Amino acid sequence: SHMATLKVIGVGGGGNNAVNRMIDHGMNNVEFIAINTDGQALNLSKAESKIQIGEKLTRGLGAGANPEIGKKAAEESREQIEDAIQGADMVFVTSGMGGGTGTGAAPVVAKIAKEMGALTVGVVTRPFSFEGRKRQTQAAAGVEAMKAAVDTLIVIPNDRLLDIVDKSTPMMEAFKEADNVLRQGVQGISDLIAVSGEVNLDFADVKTIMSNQGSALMGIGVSSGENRAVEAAKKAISSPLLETSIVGAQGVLMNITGGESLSLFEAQEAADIVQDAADEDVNMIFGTVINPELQDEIVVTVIATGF
Ligand SMILES: Nc1nc2c(ncn2[C@@H]2O[C@H](COP(=O)(O)OP(=O)(O)O)[C@@H](O)[C@H]2O)c(=O)[nH]1
Ligand SMILES: [K+]
Numbered sequence: 001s002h003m004a005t006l007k008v009i010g011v012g013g014g015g016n017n018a019v020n021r022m023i024d025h026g027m028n029n030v031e032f033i034a035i036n037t038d039g040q041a042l043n044l045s046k047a048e049s050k051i052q053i054g055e056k057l058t059r060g061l062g063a064g065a066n067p068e069i070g071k072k073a074a075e076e077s078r079e080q081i082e083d084a085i086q087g088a089d090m091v092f093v094t095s096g097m098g099g100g101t102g103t104g105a106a107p108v109v110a111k112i113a114k115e116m117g118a119l120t121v122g123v124v125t126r127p128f129s130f131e132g133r134k135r136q137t138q139a140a141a142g143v144e145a146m147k148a149a150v151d152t153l154i155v156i157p158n159d160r161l162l163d164i165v166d167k168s169t170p171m172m173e174a175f176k177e178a179d180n181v182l183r184q185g186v187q188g189i190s191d192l193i194a195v196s197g198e199v200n201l202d203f204a205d206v207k208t209i210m211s212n213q214g215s216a217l218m219g220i221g222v223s224s225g226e227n228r229a230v231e232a233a234k235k236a237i238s239s240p241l242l243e244t245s246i247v248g249a250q251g252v253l254m255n256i257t258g259g260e261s262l263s264l265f266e267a268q269e270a271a272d273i274v275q276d277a278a279d280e281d282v283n284m285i286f287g288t289v290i291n292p293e294l295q296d297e298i299v300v301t302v303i304a305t306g307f
Helices: 012-025 039-043 067-076 078-085 101-115 133-149 158-163 171-194 203-210 228-237 264-278
Strands: 006-011 030-036 049-052 090-096 119-126 152-157 217-224 251-258 283-290 297-305
Touching: 006 012, 006 078, 006 101, 006 171, 012 030, 012 039, 012 090, 012 101, 012 171, 030 039, 030 078, 030 101, 039 049, 049 078, 067 078, 067 101, 067 133, 078 101, 090 101, 090 133, 090 171, 101 119, 101 133, 119 133, 119 158, 119 171, 119 203, 133 152, 152 158, 152 171, 158 171, 171 203, 171 217, 171 251, 171 297, 203 251, 203 283, 203 297, 217 228, 228 264, 228 297, 251 264, 264 283, 264 297
Parallel strands: 006 030, 006 090, 030 049, 090 119, 119 152, 251 283
Antiparallel strands: 217 297, 251 297
């Protein structure tokens, strides 16, 4: 009966990069919106919906690292941003904090989306330490503004990308690894909404776990063979890229997809991995999907909140 309208919105350079790479990767049933002050970057966006903000302010340039320009640009294009969001049931706002457009404009976009009734998730990066202390301080203020404007917020410190590269990894490949946090969180929700589960979870459970919560973790894990349930759950909660780990979570939506071999015992093992790692008494919302096209693969999806 109900089919949730999901929109992913990139705000600023880094956010629009993410959107372009997610669109290249292929993702259906999601509307993408690109928002920027910088008209040069926007002309190259792959998104179906493009909103140039603050053209009277910047004359079509970026914000020159000034968050106040990004914020005033978003406020002045409020109506345009509302028109783009209208109809959304859920909005993901992604941006790199520390510059001028994303720092300043991404919390305004998030606010508008929450004010229109949408479940609003932010997925933002913090700058590398090598970008300097001022960039980090501006980013921190952006992160705080984002937290005040979203239902849930996922922060990716870009320094963590230095933990997963070797000395030759291309920068673009490291950036794709961070893109995965948003992409797989969105796909997980889209999949949860679209399939009926044998123990069914739907968009109302997502709203319950995510609405007005603060920090979150969104993770997916796939494994096969022996101990697949424990291994997939461990993968779902363990990302080296997250500021907010699973430790401390007090609400968890956990969906397990498997073939007809999916055992009750391994569903409990998987739930216990999450609960034990949270180190809290977790209020779990537990789902199960039987996909017979799967043989030996099991997929664990986790959304964690209540920190
Ligand atoms: N992970 C990642 N970080 C980015 C990317 N682009 C920019 N950043 C980071 O985002 C911050 C803000 O840059 P940018 O989004 O281009 O600035 P803005 O357009 O003024 O908001 C930078 O300081 C970098 O830390 C990207 O594609 N991926
Ligand atoms: K469902």
